Amino acid sequence: APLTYELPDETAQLKPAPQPGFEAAQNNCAACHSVDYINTQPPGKGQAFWDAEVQKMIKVYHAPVDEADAKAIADYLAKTY
């Protein structure tokens, strides 16, 4: 038989917020990687940092995220993290 490796269950979750970008982030930002990537970034970095993170996912890594969702997500992130 081949050898195999068992990963523990994934539990990383985004911080809830009333901004619509919370749900957009839940629906768009966990497809390629766990959301701990977001949870562990430096805190209170502000709008320009999160705008750049979101744009990099879309332009560099080809995250299929439309313009309205991209703004909602960046805005949610800059306000919440």
């Binding site: 038989a1 081949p2 050898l3 195999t4 490796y5 068992e6 990963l7 523990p8 994934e10 539990t11 990383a12 497809a31 390629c32 990687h33 766990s34 701990d36 990537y37 562990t40 970034q41 430096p42 805190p43 970095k45 940092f49 750049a52 993170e53 560099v60 890594y61 080809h62």
Partner: protein, 373 residues
Amino acid sequence: ADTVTLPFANGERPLVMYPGKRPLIGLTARPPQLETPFSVFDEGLITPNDAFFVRYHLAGIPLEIDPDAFRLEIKGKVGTPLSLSLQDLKNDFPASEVVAVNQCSGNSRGFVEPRVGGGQLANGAMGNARWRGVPLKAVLEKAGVQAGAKQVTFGGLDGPVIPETPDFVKALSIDHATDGEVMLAYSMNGADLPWLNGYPLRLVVPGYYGTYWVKHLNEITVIDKEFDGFWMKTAFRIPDNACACTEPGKAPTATIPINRFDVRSFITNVENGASVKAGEVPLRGIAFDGGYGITQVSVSADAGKSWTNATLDPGLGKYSFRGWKAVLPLTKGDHVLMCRATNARGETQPMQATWNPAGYMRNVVEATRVIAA
């Protein structure tokens, strides 16, 4: 359940248990990225397999491998393409061994000021191990490298979740790849590679940052041009100057691929606020560089006003951690301890931390406040 807090902002992390590993600092789950608790580095010069840090870029890591079916393909500008089994590598080629530090490009990123995006690591994305395998030189010689070859590319079993995301593929110069020290490692600390450390085979690139050390390595291509894959052309770039640094908040004007380690050192037996007994205080730690040899480790107990020469432990090889010990008289009260290493070509550590946009290559003189009583 268990958590720790790293000594920078937003430092909380789960302690997580993976098969074949002790509890480690969980950075990301998909793909797994695991940092080693700093305390491990005081446990001995060789980092145990069950403690060794883990870093991956892409979620599609292999989770089932048949070692009998595994083949390393050698192709491109070679006279004879090769398809090598693990049994072939072990039987048909002489084995080499090297004790070598693997360290992530962004080890210590969490300490960079101002903070930058990326993997928010403390100092635990490094480890030292005794690697055994086949020098890449021997495999390339068997294939027969053609005149005009310029680079060699390296790819593994992992892949992107979404095929448009760039595949993880790295490149070395041909003269580097054939130097005899670059190794196709099938063994780590006398055992088969732990899964997350690249079972069943990985590239080991002594004295170079870990990004080159391609895990689950199955495809080697000799090329007659410079490789312009994303993870060479765009990722892992450093400022093209002596300090590999820019003014905080400024982009470099020109970059080159990250390459050799700079000189680092740590005191391993004390941490911030540790209590020591006033008098002769024993200190110990490690130091390493890109393979030139640690010439000296100086130690201070007055925030760098004055320095005492540490005694270097017997070495395990130029690419290994080098242990050191010093005994310092500490008067009662607070003391800021520092260690600073220099290597055989004059490279050393800066007293003041520098900066670059990616937060690569940190090597500032480490300070540790202790209380003598």
